[PDB]
Amino acid sequence: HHHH
Amino acid sequence: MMAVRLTFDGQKLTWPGIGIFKATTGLPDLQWPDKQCVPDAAIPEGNYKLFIQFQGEAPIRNAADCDLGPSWGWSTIPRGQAAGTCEIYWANWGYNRIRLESADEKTRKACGGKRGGFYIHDSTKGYSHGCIEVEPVFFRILKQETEKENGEKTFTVNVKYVSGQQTNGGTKQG
C-alpha cells in the first residue's frame, strides 16, 4: 500500500 | 502499564485522562466519512492496534522514487538527506510515524479489504494520504508518558465518525  | 484506548472522531484524537490532540485524515477532497472506501480517503471506521516501540529510522525502499518501506513500530522519517522530489514527498510523512494494524475482522474486511498501510504521523499539511495526521506534541506526550513505565505498553485507537463533518482537525501549519 503506497502513499504517493 | 494500563492499556490506552485512544479515540478518533475525524477532528480530535483523545488520550483518555490526558488530553485532546488536533488530527486529520484523508486527501483534501476526500476528508469525509462517506468516502472511507476510496483510496487515500478518511481511514475506515473500526479498531486498530498502534505499534509504539521506537525502532529508529524508517527503511528506504527505493531512493530514486522516494519510496519508504513498511515497518511495524514507531520510526523516524529521513528528512535530512532528502533531495529533489523527495523533499516534496517526505514532507507529507513529517518526522515521526507509528504503524497501525486492523484489530478485528469487521475493521479488516471493511471496503472489501482493499485499503491498508495505515499510520499516525506528524506532518503539518492539513491532509493525509489515507492515514492520521496528528498535532506533533502528541509524540512528545507519548515519549514522556511511556519512558518512565517499566511494564507492558498497550495502545489501540477506535475510529468512529459521529457526523458528516469534514475529517480535518486544523493540523495545517498556522
Residue numbers in the entry:
A (entry chain B): 301 to 304
B (entry chain A): 1 to 174
Show me the paper's own sentences about this structure.
One such T6SS effector is Tlde1a from Salmonella Typhimurium. Tlde1a functions as an LD-carboxypeptidase to cleave tetrapeptide stems and as an LD-transpeptidase to exchange the terminal D-alanine of a tetrapeptide stem with a noncanonical D-amino acid. Our structural data revealed that Tlde1a possesses a unique LD-transpeptidase fold consisting of a dual pocket active site with a capping subdomain. This includes an exchange pocket to bind a D-amino acid for exchange and a catalytic pocket to position the D-alanine of a tetrapeptide stem for cleavage.
To probe the molecular features of Tlde1a that may contribute to this activity, we soaked Tlde1a crystals with D-Ala and D-Met. We were able to obtain cocrystal structures of Tlde1a in complex with each amino acid. The interaction of both D-amino acids with Tlde1a is facilitated by a salt bridge between the D-amino acid carboxylic acid and the sidechain of R115. Additional H-bonding to the carboxylic acid group is provided by the backbone amides of D40 and G116. Finally, the amide group of the D-amino acid participates in a bifurcated hydrogen bond with the acidic sidechain of D40, a water molecule, and a carbonyl of the Tlde1a His-tag cloning artifact. Moreover, in the Tlde1a native structure, the D-amino acid binding pocket is occupied by a sulfate from the crystallization condition, supporting the observation that H-bonds are the primary mode of ligand binding. It is also important to note that the Tlde1a complex with D-Ala contains a second bound D-Ala. However, this D-Ala is at a crystal packing interface, interacts with unconserved residues, and shows a poorer fit to the electron density. Taken together, these observations suggest that Tlde1a contains a D-amino acid binding pocket that may have no sidechain selectivity for the D-amino acid to be exchanged.
